[PDB]
Ligand SMILES: Nc1ncnc2c1ncn2[C@@H]1O[C@H](COP(=O)(O)CP(=O)(O)OP(=O)(O)O)[C@@H](O)[C@H]1O
Ligand SMILES: Nc1nc2c(c(=O)[nH]1)N=C(CO)CN2
Ligand SMILES: [Cl-]
């Protein structure tokens with residue numbers, strides 16, 4: 310199944326963090342990278358006392374179960390020094406969010422797929438569209454069409 314993973318970093322040299330994350334993603338068992346987006350510099354959503362993010366997206370072919378993929382993505386965040394602040398939407402060395410797990414709908418305590426907020430975020434949708442322009446969501450909406458309706462500002466390259 311193709312998992313679509315959003316990458317963000319706004320601490321400790323984002324470019325190096327995102328490069329490290331891409332290598333580590335390719336090292337996950339039973340999985341391989343299919344496609345990587347460009348790197349974009351995005352203003353923070355949420356608290357404004359934090360740096361701009363590097364945002365990207367990756368398509369990862371995998372035979373892992375979703376929660377097992379999550380165990381691996383969380384492990385890469387911790388390998389890259391991720392610390393969870395008390396505040397919501399605060400800065401991170403590395404954030405790996407599972408946007409889509411093929412066409413699955415998952416609702417568990419650890420995992421909500423499609424990612425709960427991705428449809429509201431140009432920093433998630435634009436890199437996804439770069440790597441998967443024909444994507445259709447589980448609910449039947451086309452990515453291409455969502456971007457139309459919302460008319461989110463285009464992003465700037467890192
Ligand atoms: N699709 C998904 N991808 C990644 N983590 C998910 C997820 N759905 C639920 N989670 C859960 O989200 C929890 C908190 O992860 P965090 O990375 O701290 C949230 P965040 O990415 O900072 O905010 P965001 O989800 O609004 O982007 C995880 O422990 C994980 O169990
Ligand atoms: N621009 C931008 N803002 C964010 C980001 C992100 O990746 N990019 N992710 C967040 C929570 O994970 C909080 N805010
Ligand atoms: Cl959907």
Ligand SMILES: [Mg+2]
Nearest residue numbers: 317404405406
């Ligand atoms: Mg996130």
Ligand SMILES: [Mg+2]
Nearest residue numbers: 404405406407
């Ligand atoms: Mg996250």
